[PDB]
Design a protein around this nucleic acid. Structure first.
Lengths: 36, 170, 137, 188, 197, 227
RNA sequence: UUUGCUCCACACAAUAUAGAUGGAUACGAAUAAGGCGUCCUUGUGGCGUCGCUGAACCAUAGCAGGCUAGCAACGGUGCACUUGGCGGAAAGGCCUUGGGUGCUUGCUGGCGAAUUGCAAUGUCAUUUUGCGUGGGGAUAAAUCAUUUGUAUACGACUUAGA
RNA sequence: GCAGUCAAGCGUUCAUAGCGACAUUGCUUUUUGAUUCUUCGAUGUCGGCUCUUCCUAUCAUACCGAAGCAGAAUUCGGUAAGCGUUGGAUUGUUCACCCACUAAUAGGGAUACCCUACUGAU
RNA sequence: AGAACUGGCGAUGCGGGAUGAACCGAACGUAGAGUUAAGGUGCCGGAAUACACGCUCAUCAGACACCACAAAAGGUGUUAGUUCAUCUAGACAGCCGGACGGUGGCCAUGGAAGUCGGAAUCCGCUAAGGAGUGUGUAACAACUCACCGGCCGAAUGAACUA
RNA sequence: GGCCAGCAUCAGUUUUGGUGGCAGGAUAAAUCCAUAGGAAUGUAGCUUGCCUCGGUAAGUAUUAUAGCCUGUG
């Protein structure tokens, strides 16, 4: 048939090392909420 | 690594008006003496409020098992802290010595629950001398008498790259 | 012609008293016998008459044979050497072709080049004889 | 969990023979001959004597074992095809429009022709397979009889025609007509 | 060790054959491959067909006459998944693949010649039993190799002529083996028996 | 995973447990010492109102039923263990479904009463058929005027498991050809038993049989082998 | 347009190797199965035997392989001839008859090796081409220009003309 | 949206220190289709064509399942992107919304001789 | 974005991260030999298709921490478990039978009898049998399991976790 | 007495093999030898049901016509 698009696992940089850089900040938020 | 068994006995402190706190021992599994000592303090802190500065070793003894030749169907109780919170276990093994048994067990937990050695407390390891106290099947099926089974389809391994024979198993 | 002829599937199945050959370690091509299975992959062995000490092993470091004799599980080394002497397995191994091949490669490697020269000239002497055995009959 | 081995048994009467090279099986007996290929499923057989035979698996998983009982179910059906042979039966029913039913042998193909489905002009052929025979029914009105030794062949052929006479674009709650099976039994 | 090596691609695995073939090339053993339509791949037919279609849809957006060639035939598949393993863009690559000659069936002169295999790539060894695979001849036939019924026929001709050869060779080696057996139990033979021959 | 999901209900009924098993195991031995005789009655196919009838008939006697090995629990199988002496021999012979009777009036009235007591139940006997016409509640055993047609819902079942040819016109059910349902002098197929159930034909004779008896003061086994 | 073009051998020259330096040594088919010898009821037959790597098989001694002597056996092998086969998938090779022709390390003898000075790849093969060799073999197209026009941006494609 | 109920579970241990899964109840502009012509600061520059390809989450065309399907046609849903989706009326303005056809008239995205690409040629 | 300590950058090369403003390692003369770091050893690519225990088979499998992550949950795919339960005084699957009365229980109705429906919902015998889960008649009727016993004999079920 | 090389012995750095002597731990545990007891995935022997006349199934049987385990030395 017309077998559909395959989405990558390439480098494609946003996600990866910069977003859960912020999610390390989310672990900071976890510490901030654990006080309550 | 290639594990070993270790006796470790520790003594809280020589102190005045409490000389010789009573004693504290453990049966400990490790590759060398140091990891045994560290696991010993790690579990010994958990039992009561003492520290390495408020702790001291009496002595240790390496433990060579008594009967290497003897097959011994072991059964072992374990607690561990997974990705999620903690829980307990009982398992059943047919191996030779405590050291080879637990060496297989740690690999098995490493496979089946991603168990790294840090988060896994050996509660107890034991021998099951009689039958009729084994519960599992993946040990039980090796124990009937006149037991035989084949090894079909041996994957040979040549060192050479080419060969001229279009090979056969057996 | 009213019966079925289904095959044997003749397989060197492992059992107590089965006999094997080790291919790496220090034992290094010595015979050995089986006292007790543990698992699919791990067994427990000894031949003292071949020389190897008692141990556990994984089956990848060993290979079986067709040979087999009678023996009970949990045995001790005096007992298995006794049964081994009863079965006379070493002479039977020597009778077999496998051990002859193994000694053949061993001698073929341990040759001296002068002995190999003798091998050359003897084969030259042989081929004329046999090639006249052919082409006449 | 690697059940170290598992086994089922195939018990067989005297007069029939069987024969198996590597996985290639044949059954010869009273009614005649059958044959099948089992090279795809990686199991092992062994005979004890002359009425009974043990399939077996060594060091197998759940799927690798679940092959086994299905093989037993295959082989008993194979044997019983040679001892009894199998018999199915259909009825070619209608409310207003009598179906025509016909065997035709063109090129030795032994096709099955049918006409007059709710007045439709189309001819619908259903072929006939090897080792399966067809009989228009004696002394039972609006009935057809099947006979053979291969359950899979006869059942596949029975399924083909009842798919080919399948109604579409319409309500089966009101419309009824269609060929189905009375039962599935042996010859004997 | 030889000048030339002649591989039968039967019961074999594409990646694991491509790998050793590449290294033996770039070390300089001229290689020919044959019977590539008897080749095999892990994974089932539908998996491999979808892997092929996802390649199939990829061409240049604007002009396909320059874009990627979706070669169909099996020898060319094996060559594709080998030139991915070597540096074809360089000259060492091109002077590797001027040592590789890939065919279907066994055309001459190689049919009279010694076919070999590679044990560390075989299906039966390097896979577990109870597991699927795909025949490359069937896959190429399913994506537009229009030739499969023909190599079948020529394989038949080669098979029958080789069996007729094998009869002769079996009879002759029976004769010489009987002769050498009669040559046995003679001291000229017993010395060789002492010295391992 | 990949299990056969055991189907669950929300019925107000509850399961039996082991309390009933221990209860009957106690009550058997309770009947043992108080009553004099212990009779064994071999009976496999029994009816609920019939058992109600025979229960209310003999209040002087006590009839009890239960699992075989639970009765062996109560009485004790071996001579080495049993409630009282000379019962282990009777423990062996009881093979099938058996109901235990405890009498204290007479040994002969018990054995003769049930040989006198005979009823008509299903075979599970003569032959029967249907005509090749309209079918009825009896199916031609009675006149067709007073015979009412079978209900049309169960006609597919007659086609399915009784295998009978049938086709439903307006509300009267009909067939094209007759069928002898069974023959005489042979134990019946399940289809034959079930069709005589559906017709309602208890053509088979029924006698509850006795195989042995006991008596305490004699303390001996009475072997009464009759059907 | 001076006698150019080819194929048989051969003396010399050059031009370089994606890299020779004992042998690319033939069944097929499965692998939870098979090869080989053999037997007969020819079989999905039996009996025996083998595998666990070709660490094999075949070949192999002479000055980089000489000159000679015999002994025994009818063989092996090269070279050019010769006979009849086979093979089209990219056959371009594999058989076989006949003799001729050598060598034989199958066994035993005699002669010579030096001096490259302790080793220095110590040059042995094979691609292509050329000029000379003396012996056979055959002695044409195309393009342009011109003309047509089924074609036509210019080229081209198609035609015709002794 | 807000506020409860129901409450699988969680909490050095936990109802009740407290959260919380899914449903349910609260009117939120009118219980008998009577209507009400409610477009209430659209503050941005694109708008409208020539015209190519791609995505499907399909509007018809395929094949199918279930639906009170007696039929015709319709209501939904599934695989489906192979092929197709119009002529007019109205504003600088895309905002706004009709007539009729057809099987339907689905939604979206993407100076110029110079070297490149494309169409063609020795 | 509001504040404060420390570190990396900016001036700063190099090995790895396939490539990089921020990651790991490590700071520089020119050179030779050696050994390692972080990362890796199917091939591109120097280095093992090393050994060993398990798991997984994806109609887009997955292949690295922070350098494209989602849970809640759903899943008759597979594995290891915990806790409850039953069991040769017979576990579960499967076959057969039993599965009774006042009872067709109460009004409801034109008809409603175990099931169009609301209230209730019990007791005798019982091994067991509810004022009765579904099948379905306008009503009834008939059938099945849930509840029990037989014939076969070894383990098996439920919930939860990862 | 310029250029390129080789051989031996020694020096520095470094790599890789085989072999020898020693101390330790439970003065290794083990194996092995003697020794008491026990049980079975029950050995001989005995007993039973058939039955191809041994071959199963139980029941016995603790070394016997095999042996094993624990404990001590």
């Amino acid at each position: 048939m017309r077998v559909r698009k395959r989405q990558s696992r390439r480098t494609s940089t946003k996600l990866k090392e910069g977003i859960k850089k912020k999610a390390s900040a989310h672990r900071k938020k976890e510490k901030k909420m654990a006080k309550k | 690594a290639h594990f070993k068994e270790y006796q470790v006995i520790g003594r809280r402190l020589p102190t005045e008006s409490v000389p010789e706190p009573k004693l504290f021992r453990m049966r400990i599994f490790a590759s060398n003496e140091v990891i045994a000592k560290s696991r010993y303090w790690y579990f010994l802190q958990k039992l009561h409020k003492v520290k390495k500065a408020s702790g001291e070793i009496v002595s240790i003894n390496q433990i060579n098992e008594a009967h290497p030749t003897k097959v011994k169907n072991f059964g072992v109780w374990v607690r561990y802290d997974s990705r999620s919170g903690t829980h307990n276990m009982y398992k059943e093994i047919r191996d030779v010595s405590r050291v080879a048994a637990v060496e297989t067990l740690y690999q098995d937990m490493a496979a089946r629950h991603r168990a790294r050695f840090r988060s896994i407390h050996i509660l107890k390891v034991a021998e099951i001398e009689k039958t009729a106290d084994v519960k599992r099947q993946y040990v039980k099926q090796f124990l009937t008498k006149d037991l035989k089974f084949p090894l079909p389809h041996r994957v040979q391994k040549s060192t050479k790259t080419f060969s001229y024979k279009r090979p056969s198993t057996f | 012609s009213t019966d079925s002829i289904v095959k044997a599937s003749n397989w060197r199945l492992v059992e107590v008293g089965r006999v094997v050959l080790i291919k790496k370690g220090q034992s290094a091509g010595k015979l050995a016998a089986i006292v007790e299975i543990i698992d699919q992959k791990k067994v427990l062995i000894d031949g003292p008459k071949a020389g190897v000490p008692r141990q556990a092993i994984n089956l990848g470091q060993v290979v079986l044979t067709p040979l087999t004799f009678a023996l009970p599980r949990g045995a001790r080394t005096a007992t298995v050497s006794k049964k081994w002497a009863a079965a006379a397995v070493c002479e039977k191994w020597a009778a077999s072709s496998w051990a002859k091949k193994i000694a053949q490669r061993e001698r073929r490697a341990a040759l001296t080049d002068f002995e190999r020269f003798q091998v050359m000239v003897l084969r030259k002497q042989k081929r004329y004889t046999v090639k006249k055995a052919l082409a006449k009959a | 969990m690697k059940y170290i081995q598992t086994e089922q048994q195939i018990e067989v009467p005297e007069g029939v023979t069987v024969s198996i090279k590597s996985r290639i099986v044949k059954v010869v007996g009273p009614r005649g001959t059958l044959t099948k290929n089992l090279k795809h499923i990686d199991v092992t057989f062994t005979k004890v004597n002359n009425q009974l035979i043990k399939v077996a698996v060594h060091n197998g998983g759940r799927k690798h074992v679940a092959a086994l009982r299905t093989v037993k179910s295959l082989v008993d059906n194979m044997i019983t095809g040679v001892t009894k042979g199998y018999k199915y039966k259909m009825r070619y029913v209608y409310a207003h429009f009598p179906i025509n039913v016909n065997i035709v042998e063109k090129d030795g193909a032994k096709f099955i022709e049918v006409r007059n489905f709710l007045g439709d002009k189309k001819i619908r052929n259903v072929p006939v397979r090897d080792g399966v025979t067809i009989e228009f029914s004696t002394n039972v009105k609006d009935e057809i009889v099947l006979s053979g030794n291969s359950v899979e062949d006869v059942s596949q052929n029975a399924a083909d025609l009842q798919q080919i006479c399948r109604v579409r674009n319409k309500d089966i709650r009101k419309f009824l007509d269609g060929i189905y099976v009375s039962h599935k039994g042996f010859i004997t | 060790v030889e000048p030339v090596v002649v591989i039968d691609g039967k019961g074999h695995l594409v990646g694991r054959l491509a790998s050793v073939v590449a290294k033996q090339l770039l070390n300089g053993q001229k290689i020919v491959v044959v019977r590539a339509e008897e080749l095999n791949i892990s994974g089932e037919f539908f998996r491999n067909k979808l892997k092929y279609h996802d390649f199939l849809r990829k061409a240049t957006a604007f002009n396909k006459t320059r874009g990627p060639f979706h070669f169909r035939a099996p020898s060319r598949i094996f060559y594709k998944a080998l030139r991915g393993m070597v540096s074809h863009k360089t000259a060492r690559g091109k002077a590797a693949l001027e040592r590789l000659k890939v065919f279907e069936g066994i055309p001459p002169p190689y049919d009279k010649k010694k076919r070999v295999v590679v044990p560390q790539a075989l299906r039966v060894l390097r896979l577990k039993p109870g597991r699927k695979y795909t025949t490359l001849g069937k896959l190429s036939t399913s994506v537009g190799w229009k030739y499969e019924d023909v190599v079948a026929k020529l394989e038949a001709k080669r098979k029958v002529s080789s069996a007729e050869y094998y009869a002769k060779k079996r009879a002759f080696t029976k004769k010489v083996a009987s002769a050498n057996a009669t040559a046995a139990e003679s001291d000229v033979a017993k010395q060789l028996a002492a010295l391992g021959y | 995973r990949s299990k056969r999901s055991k189907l669950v209900t929300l019925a107000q009924t509850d399961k039996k447990g082991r309390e009933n098993k221990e209860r009957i195991f106690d009550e058997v031995r309770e009947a043992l010492d108080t009553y004099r005789y212990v009779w064994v009655l071999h009976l496999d196919d029994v009816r609920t109102p019939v058992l109600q009838e025979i229960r209310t008939s003999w209040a002087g006697s006590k009839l009890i039923m239960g699992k075989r090995k639970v009765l062996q629990k109560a009485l004790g199988e071996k001579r080495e263990e049993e409630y009282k002496e000379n019962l282990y021999q009777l423990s062996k012979l009881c093979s099938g479904v058996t109901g235990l009777l405890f009498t204290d009036e007479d040994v002969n009235t018990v054995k003769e009463y049930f040989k006198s007591y005979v009823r008509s139940d299903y075979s599970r006997p003569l032959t029967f058929t249907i005509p090749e016409g309209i079918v009825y509640s009896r199916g031609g055993q009675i006149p067709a005027e007073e015979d009412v047609p079978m209900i049309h819902s169960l006609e597919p079942t007659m086609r399915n498991k009784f295998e009978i040819p049938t086709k439903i016109k307006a509300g009267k059910i009909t067939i094209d050809s007759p069928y002898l349902v069974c023959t005489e002098g042979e134990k019946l197929d399940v289809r034959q038993a079930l069709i005589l159930k559906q017709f309602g034909i208890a053509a088979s004779e029924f006698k509850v049989k006795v195989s042995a008896y006991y008596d305490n003061d004699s303390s001996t086994v009475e072997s009464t082998n009759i059907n």
